């Protein structure tokens, strides 16, 4: 059987990496943030099929995100007046 | 507001502010209305040869409100009094490229011209 | 002073400076979580401009284990 | 050079990646026709289009059945409005809605006119939210639709859409509303708030321009005349080959909005707070239009006295920001929706709208904070109505 713990934690760090590469910081910001709470508010579900439910939907989405990510740098624009 | 002729009276002011009303070399023009979103305050300060040798605005409108009457107020300056008379809403137009939507913008700059010059002729009178 | 790496760990951890010293564990000195220690490590690798990998990584559970890395990493 | 910041998700707003993401298949490889019956281009591409009609109707307690796609909440108001009014044209000749309805709307009812339709355009009061005892007693015995919108675009004021449709329901009226500004940003049960027509935008909710959907209750069953002719796509509601991306990508907006919905508005709200009372404490004479005890935070309005909308826009170069409307009639000609709220017509000169969504961060928001904050003070430095008003005079007293 994986662990989950494991699973989770490796999910964590590859779905927080891949996002800070988001070209555009709206998209960018919200991944990280968004991941951020999500996993926060989902810290103490016990039941192992529900986590394995949530572990699913983060592989996907981690999906999601390497392929946005390469297409936003494909068809990338100018940055806001806020990173500077 | 897009063009930089007309954003630039705003990033840029000029001529901003007020002379003495009660001044007999001081005309004062004031346009416009609140509930049409266009007021403009128009002043212009007159030698004793009759050449402007200052002037001043304040507007409530927008970019090409201001511009127009930003523009009015430095244009004034150096003419005389008969000189600026002939200044027209479609001079300011052409210079700041105006769209027809806001060619109103550039007839009350005139019209605060023409009225700053006669309330300045009313104060000689006597 | 590469003891940045004190206010990385207090930013990251909300704990004051004070409280950063380099005995502590982030989990049983400074009440770090694991997913804290995931971003703490990831703040390291952004404020040093470092890669640490996760044999590495695993080896950081400490202030002083963390000075010691980025020392030995430019 | 470097770009504004976006804070006006009212007009539109960006793709969500995750809505790209299932979309971008059926650009590529599964570009089948969902109507051509006889191919696997065909199958998988009616697949993904029922997938979708789901997710649409699991977002607002709708039978998937229920859900009509169209090419935007504009097509569909018009089918809603236009659809009941010709369906029993020949029994009902009245219909309500209210002043400040989006043009689409607005326009629709004034065809219906011209076409000899009665139409009641019910007030608002001062707040934004219609009388629902106004409401009631503007029902006839001949009147065939009511329509009020879920959330307004101009002010983001949330008309009682629960008690209007319980007032509907009961005098068997339809009861439309257009929630093109609600969907997937506050709570919808079609059944719940007994809602019998129910337009949706999918570029408001972070889906993809050019489509949208009507919800039309089945039971009891809604009787609409179809108003785009054709091959009978859609059960004749709605002709015209269905745009399997644009679906996806509706459908998907629908999901994630279902999933997100809550988080948001939590999010949403602590920013628009901060906005409105960061900008009220540094800045004398602002006022918020639309009653902030029945409002959707992100969106905005606030009127700054002395200093005119466009102006302050202008000034704020660097944020990305409208002073309402239909894109249109916002500050040109004023908002007609902030006129029939009773704002005096120089400060509806005066107005403009922040809009606050799914992606604006807490920096962006400070940052157009302190920009409005210095640019309302130098505007209002160049105003002769500030000027007049700080020498004592009373501007209701000048003769303009
Ligand atoms: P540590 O303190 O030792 O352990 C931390 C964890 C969470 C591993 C520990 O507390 C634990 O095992 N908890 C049990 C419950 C659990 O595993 N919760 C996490 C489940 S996985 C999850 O919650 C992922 C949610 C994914 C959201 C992604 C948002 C994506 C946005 C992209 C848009 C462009
Ligand atoms: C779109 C836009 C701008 C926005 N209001 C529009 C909208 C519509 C029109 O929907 P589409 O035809 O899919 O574009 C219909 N009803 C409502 C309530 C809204 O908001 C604005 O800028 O105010
Ligand atoms: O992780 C985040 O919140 C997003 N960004 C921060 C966004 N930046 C913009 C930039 O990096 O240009 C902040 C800013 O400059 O406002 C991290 C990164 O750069 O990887």
Redesign the pocket.
Known sequence: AASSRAQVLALYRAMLRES?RFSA?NY??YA??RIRDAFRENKNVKDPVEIQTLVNKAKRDLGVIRRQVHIGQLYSTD?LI??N | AYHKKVVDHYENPRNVGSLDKTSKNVGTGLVGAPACGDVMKLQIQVDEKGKIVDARFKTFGCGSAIASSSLATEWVKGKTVEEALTIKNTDIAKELCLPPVKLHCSMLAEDAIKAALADYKLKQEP | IEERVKKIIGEQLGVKQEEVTNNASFVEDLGADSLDTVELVMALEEEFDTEIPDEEAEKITTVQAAIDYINGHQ | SLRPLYMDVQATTPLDPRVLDAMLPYLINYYGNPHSRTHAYGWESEAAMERARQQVASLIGADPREIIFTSGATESNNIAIKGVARFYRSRKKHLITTQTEHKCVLDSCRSLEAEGFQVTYLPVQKSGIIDLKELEAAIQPDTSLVSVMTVNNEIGVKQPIAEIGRICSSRKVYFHTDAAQAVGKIPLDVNDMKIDLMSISGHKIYGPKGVGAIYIRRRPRVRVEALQSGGGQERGMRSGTVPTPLVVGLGAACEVAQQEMEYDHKRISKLSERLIQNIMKSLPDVVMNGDPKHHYPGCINLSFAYVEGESLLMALKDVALSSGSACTSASLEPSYVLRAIGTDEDLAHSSIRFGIGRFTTE?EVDYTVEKCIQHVKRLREMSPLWEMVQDGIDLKSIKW
């Open positions: 800070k910081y960018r910001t990280v943030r940055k806020i990173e | 920096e």
